[PDB]
Structure 1
Amino acid sequence: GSLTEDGLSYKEKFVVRSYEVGSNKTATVETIANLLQEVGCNHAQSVGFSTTMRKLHLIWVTARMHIEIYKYPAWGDVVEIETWCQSEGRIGTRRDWILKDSVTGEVTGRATSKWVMMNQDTRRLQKVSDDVRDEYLVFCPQEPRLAFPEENNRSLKKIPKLEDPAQYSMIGLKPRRADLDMNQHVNNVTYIGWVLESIPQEIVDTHELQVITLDYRRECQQDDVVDSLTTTTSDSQFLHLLRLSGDGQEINRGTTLWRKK
């Protein structure tokens, strides 16, 4: 991969792997999500960032992830992904992505993520300071560059809390070592897989996932156990909730949109 000519964005090509595809012989949404995280980490490395504010014990954390896929790439196909960041004042930052078929050059998908500033110890959120905002802006486009430009778009919709009883459920989900990152935290993509576990297999077999919006409220520790809840709100639409198996503490909520194959 490499930064573009202006140095304000980053592109990388990936060849789809055999173990990365599902029953349709095309990449799963978790393979897509992993590739988005990888090109994001590679963009961070290219401009000197770690996966000045380290002394204050301050980190960026994901609050929301929104992904829309038009075509999933097949095993052996090449996918090109362009990514870039932008500041949103004191709320936090945003990382966007565009996915293209390397052969046709057509847009096959797009994604956007909202990130907030928090203390690594204490987990307390904060507004972004001017000192941080200054050294961040030099690696971003100055004029707004949105993967989802449309006024009143799906990526900015408020998500409601699922009411008991859920229509569907998958209980007792636990992360294994493969679900952790190099810093021993559960990888954000595992939460997507856990959300989708409560979708019935018949919907998976007859529909393709088109849109997924996921809010990240609280981290799942290594020794925690999660319950995945899903209720049909409708094309098929679902409302999702991930909560701790015991006390019911919310870790995530989201929505998915599926189209008939």
Structure 2
Amino acid sequence: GSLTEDGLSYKEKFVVRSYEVGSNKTATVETIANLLQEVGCNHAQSVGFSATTTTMRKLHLIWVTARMHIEIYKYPAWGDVVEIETWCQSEGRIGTRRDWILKDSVTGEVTGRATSKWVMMNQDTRRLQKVSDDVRDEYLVFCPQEPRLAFPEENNRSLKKIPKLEDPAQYSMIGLKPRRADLDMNQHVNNVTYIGWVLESIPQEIVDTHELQVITLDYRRECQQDDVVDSLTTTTSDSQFLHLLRLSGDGQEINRGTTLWRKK
């Protein structure tokens, strides 16, 4: 991978691996979510980060995902080359936004796109807060000044309010515990695991007869290593579903989202 000519975005090609595809011989949405996360990490290293800034490290402040939205038009097949272009952008005092464009390496056409909202939060306390001093100026030099959105369209699927799933849920997958492979380098549950857990309540018949077109996921709380999750789903409709991830015990909401599926 490498930064573009202007240095305001990063590009990287990937070859789809055999263990990364589903029954239809095309990359799974979790594989795509992993590749976006990988290209975002490389963009952060290529600009001098480790993701954190100078003032963000002297003060115990980290970046945490608040929302992830992924729209796929074509899933790359096992063996295909896919180029993802990512970039950061300021969103005022709210936080940072990171967008991605998935392209086919042979045809050059956009096969998918994604957007994500990020918030501040103290590492040692887990608050929210916001700052504009050194922090805003530190990443402003690595972001395009004029608006560059992956989903520009006024009133689009990436900015909609997600409602809370009412009980009882139509479908459910209970007793979901994360394992060492689900944790990251800091021993925190990877954000991609929540995507796989949300899709665990989707019926197998829906998966075998439909393709996941859109997936919006709001992040409310972090599932810990010793926690157990309950995935809940209800059909609201193409097929639309409302999702809810909560701790098996108290019923503490950790995630909520929506999925759209097209007939094959």
TM-score between both structures, scaled by the size of structure 2: 0.98
Distance 2:56 2:173 in 1: 40
| 1:135 Cα offset (Å) | 1.1
Does the CA-based 8 Å contact 1:79-1:102 persist in structure 2? Answer: yes
Residue 167 of structure 2 aligns to a residue whose secondary structure is coil
1:115-154 map, 5 Å: 115-154=118-157
Name the counterpart of 1:10.
Answer: 10
| 1:129 Cα offset (Å) | 2.2
Name the counterpart of 1:175.
Answer: 178
Residue 59 of structure 1 aligns to a residue whose secondary structure is coil
| 1:53 Cα offset (Å) | 1.5
Distance 2:166 2:125 in 1: 30
| 1:258 Cα offset (Å) | 0.2
| 1:221 Cα offset (Å) | 0.3
- Post-superposition Cα deviations, 1:142-177, rounded to whole Å, max 9, x if no partner, equal 000000000000000000000000000000000000
Distance 2:258 2:151 in 1: 17
1:238-249 map, 5 Å: 238-249=241-252
- Post-superposition Cα deviations, 1:57-113, rounded to whole Å, max 9, x if no partner, equal 000100000000000000000000000000001000000000000000000000000
Number of aligned pairs? 261
Name the counterpart of 1:62.
Answer: 65
1:26 is the counterpart of 2:26: yes
| 1:128 Cα offset (Å) | 3.0
- Post-superposition Cα deviations, 1:115-141, rounded to whole Å, max 9, x if no partner, equal 000100110001232320011100000
Q: Where do 4+ consecutive residues of structure 1 move more than 6 Å?
A: none
Distance 2:56 2:174 in 1: 39
**Between 182-191 and 46-55, the greater mean CA deviation after superposition:** 46-55
Does the CA-based 8 Å contact 1:97-1:112 persist in structure 2? Answer: yes
**Between 119-128 and 4-13, the greater mean CA deviation after superposition:** 119-128
Does the CA-based 8 Å contact 1:95-1:113 persist in structure 2? Answer: yes
- Post-superposition Cα deviations, 1:4-62, rounded to whole Å, max 9, x if no partner, equal 00000000000000000000000000000000000000000000111931111000100
1:1-261 map, 5 Å: 1-50=1-50, 52-261=55-264
Distance 2:56 2:221 in 1: 22
**Between 41-50 and 51-60, the greater mean CA deviation after superposition:** 51-60
Does the CA-based 8 Å contact 2:55-2:134 persist in structure 1? Answer: no
Does the CA-based 8 Å contact 1:227-1:244 persist in structure 2? Answer: yes
Does the CA-based 8 Å contact 1:92-1:128 persist in structure 2? Answer: no
Does the CA-based 8 Å contact 1:110-1:147 persist in structure 2? Answer: yes
| Stretches of structure 2 lacking an aligned partner (at least 5 in a row) | none
Alpha-carbon RMSD across the aligned residues, in angstroms, is 0.9
Does the CA-based 8 Å contact 1:65-1:111 persist in structure 2? Answer: yes
Distance 1:34 1:126 in 2: 28
| 1:190 Cα offset (Å) | 0.2
Does the CA-based 8 Å contact 1:218-1:250 persist in structure 2? Answer: yes
Does the CA-based 8 Å contact 1:91-1:128 persist in structure 2? Answer: no
Percentage identity across aligned positions?
100
